[PDB]
Amino acid sequence: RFRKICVFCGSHSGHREVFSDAAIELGNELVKRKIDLVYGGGSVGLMGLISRRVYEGGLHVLGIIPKALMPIEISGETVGDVRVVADMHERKAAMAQEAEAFIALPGGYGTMEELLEMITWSQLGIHKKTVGLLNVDGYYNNLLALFDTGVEEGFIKPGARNIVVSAPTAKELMEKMEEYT
Amino acid sequence: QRSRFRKICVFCGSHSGHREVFSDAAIELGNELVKRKIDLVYGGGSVGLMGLISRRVYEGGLHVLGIIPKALMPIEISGETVGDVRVVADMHERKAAMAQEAEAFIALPGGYGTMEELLEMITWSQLGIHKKTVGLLNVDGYYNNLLALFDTGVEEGFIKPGARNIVVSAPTAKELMEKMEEYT
């Protein structure tokens, strides 16, 4: 049973409704399960939608963002708390620490970098937290093929491939991450 | 020959892969670094791919530096060392120190950890954090799935053109070098 999670996404929602709509479903799952949210502090894109839902849903919303990135990811009128930090690094250690599991929701390079990093810490044993993945409309099928390529070729261990918990819907992803211990 | 780089950081780990083609590639990149008078920078691993491109740039007269978090020394360095092995306390220290010393990067094939530096360095270029070309030897299409993922990001609006333009890859160290030497 989780107390909070740090979803990874960006300032874009994606052209097709499935991505934004997928982000709304994750928010609704977090609300129903009474789980607080940790994220990049962005007030727009999938980040805006995610915290926007959990906030209104009641649960706590803790955003974490680097000083210089604020003019980029925060526009409009902020909702929820933000613990500004030094830079990308502090952000990296701030998103983990202040959170539990990790759903690296569909996103761009920043989000990809965040996912690979959390899995990397679990692989090395730096920390022991569930690393999930919401594979909306197969957006990550490729990334899911690269991990294996790494296994088959010998750069990733067969067991280490099991660090990634993915599903096509927020509902199943949450169940999976709750049905694995 | 001439080059616009003096120091190159190559991402890769302590595993060389099952097929010998990947080890062959690691050495070739070393050769491309040596022929161009480029010093090497890496994680400090003595085995795997790191152990190959490190012992190559060394036997080439160019300096080698294996920056590594102290807790990863016992598990990484073994048998001996090559060049200088800068040692730090954690991950971010290594990430910043390797990136701070590098004028460019190349992600040789590798597992999760390799995909860690590769994505962040590109992410940093995308955010204008630094102005540095990002490379990756795409041995036998090892990353054909990552490039396809990037394309997917572009086609779905999460990745703009210019950003996708950050990645500079090739199937051989020679072409990759030629493509990166000519990047803007």
From Swiss-Prot, chain A:
Q: Which cellular compartments is it found in? A: Cytoplasm; Nucleus
Q: From the UniProt record, list the reaction(s) this protein catalyses.
A: N(6)-(dimethylallyl)adenosine 5'-phosphate + H2O = N(6)-dimethylallyladenine + D-ribose 5-phosphate; 9-ribosyl-trans-zeatin 5'-phosphate + H2O = trans-zeatin + D-ribose 5-phosphate
Which positions are annotated as binding substrate?
A: 73, 91-92, 108-114, 120
Its cellular-component GO annotations read: cytosol; nucleus; plasma membrane
Domain of life of the source: Eukaryota
EC top class, as a word: hydrolase
| Identification of the protein by name | Cytokinin riboside 5'-monophosphate phosphoribohydrolase LOG8
Annotated source species: Arabidopsis thaliana
Give from-to of the shown chain within the full protein: 8 to 188 of 216
